[PDB]
Amino acid sequence: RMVDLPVIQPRLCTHARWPAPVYGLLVDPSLPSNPQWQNGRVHVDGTLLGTTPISGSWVSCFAAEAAYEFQSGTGEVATFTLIEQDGSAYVPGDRAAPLGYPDFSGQLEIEVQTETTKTGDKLKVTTFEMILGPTTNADQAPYQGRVFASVTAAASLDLVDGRVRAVPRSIYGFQDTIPEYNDGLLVPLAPPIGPFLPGEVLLRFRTYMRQIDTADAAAEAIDCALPQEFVSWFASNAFTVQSEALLLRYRNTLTGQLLFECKLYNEGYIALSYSGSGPLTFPTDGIFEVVSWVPRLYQLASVGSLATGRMLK
Amino acid sequence: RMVDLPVIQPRLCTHARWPAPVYGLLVDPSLPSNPQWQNGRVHVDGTLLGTTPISGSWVSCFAAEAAYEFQSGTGEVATFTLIEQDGSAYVPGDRAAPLGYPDFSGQLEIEVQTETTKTGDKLKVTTFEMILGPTTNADQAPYQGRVFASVTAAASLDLVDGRVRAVPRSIYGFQDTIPEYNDGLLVPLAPPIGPFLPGEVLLRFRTYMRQIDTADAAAEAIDCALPQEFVSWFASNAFTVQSEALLLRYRNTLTGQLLFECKLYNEGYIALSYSGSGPLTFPTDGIFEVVSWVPRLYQLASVGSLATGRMLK
């Protein structure tokens, strides 16, 4: 009956916003304090929010029927009439897009393959680039079930069409801000993450995206509030909630070293007490242990950087 | 306590042997009855077997210290000194390879990228071909921590030696038998799946790999005993077991329809009683519900094909 957590190290976890392993664990107060992320969002009681999928393989992916219409500038624009990734029809409802749809902006390179239904299905593979963010009006409406992308590479020599699946490859001009999901119109969104007590900052699980630039490719950070294993854990257990937050300890179980305490708020984000200005990273080889229910106003033991050097200045 | 299962439909799950969604759920008695899969293996009491990772982002992937050398007539040849995918050192131990290492044979196209440690790290990407099975003359020895791959090339590529992560792209000449992990030497392996009673057959959760050839590509099936979400469920829960199996019912929750019953043997594989010769597929929109502990000798209600047609010969 009491909430517990799986004893899984962050470095062994799956990322909830880009389909890759978790590499980092940190707080940063220079970043936006209350992000509006649509994936990786669940309450402690198991209520999934936004576009958050159960399966980590759905993260920042989509599925569609693909069809073509020719275009003047860039050749060969595909129209993608979205479907949910399990092949079921997508119906505009009470979330921003199909489950696992990307919840950030920039120009995404996606690889698109013919839907696989049985051994022997002939498969085509085509790479596209897709503009996720507002861009004035583009007729990007993933809420309404229709998005567009331009061909960048044929792997196949026969352009992919029909029912397809799209996976993310790399990003250009990444901005961690949600994309126009519904043109200019109001869309259903999980709320900004928060609020935090004074001195509290969001615990971030970090992975890296291949970001392209002029004649260089470099890692670009993307954060989520909980790893996918914790998202599906809460969804699957549907625990009864008894306070506003849980007090957690993050501990290395081999050595016994207690690393920090933190607060998991019932709305599915974790807070650390930290007064520094720059990023503070933690080891990713500890485990989270639930300690007890605590009230909102519970004051955490603070953490700080292990580098103690300072200057007179 | 009280062993239960997450209410997750198969079509919403992640596969445990190839990094992609589950698409199919079926029995085939024409397939090998007792496969020796190394990934997707876990006991109901939470004991992980073989090379089974927690994270589905680890499945059929590896990480390595890459060293590169050119050979005329062949191309660039990569020597990969294996590490675990979290970056920790790989030590040959009580399993056949680093966690999540491919557990089947054939020639695998891998995409290899510089390891992502922090934002700004410059990234290079190259596609290699890696022969998994005996594959003629090589010291393919993932158990000892060293594997080789190549790319056909007219002259040297620019390749810098360093830490990499490798992900699977396509397969050629797929065979679902384990690779030679340790040359001609004995190696630690999860046992063959089984035994089954007379008339019982393995339940297969199915996904599809891109299997290639010249200017052609087709879906090729691969099966696993449990989706990854069930693998991480039993590992995280560490349930106390009783008896020799759990009786489960697979049901559609929207219609209420009971589809079949099956036995989840405590050693982590599911049987169904089926006397047909050909494949029998099932809908992937049901849920598995735990009904009871049962003995090894428990006789399941049989299933059969929904097509009743027969000819007088």
Automatic annotation (TrEMBL), chains A, B:
Q: Where does Ca(2+) bind?
A: Q211, D213, E220
- Where the record annotates domain Calicivirus coat protein C-terminal, the positions are 82-311
Keyword list, A-Z: Calcium, Host cytoplasm, Metal-binding, Virion
Superkingdom: Viruses
Q: Which of this chain's residues are annotated to bind Mg(2+) 1?
A: Q211, D213, E220
Record localization: Host cytoplasm; Virion
* GO cellular component term of the entry, any: host cell cytoplasm
One GO biological process term is: antigenic variation
Q: Enumerate the residues binding Mg(2+) 2.
A: D213, D216, E220
Keyword hit for Metal-binding: yes
According to its UniProt record, which protein family does this protein belong to?
A: Belongs to the caliciviridae capsid protein family.
Q: What is this protein identified as?
A: Capsid protein VP1
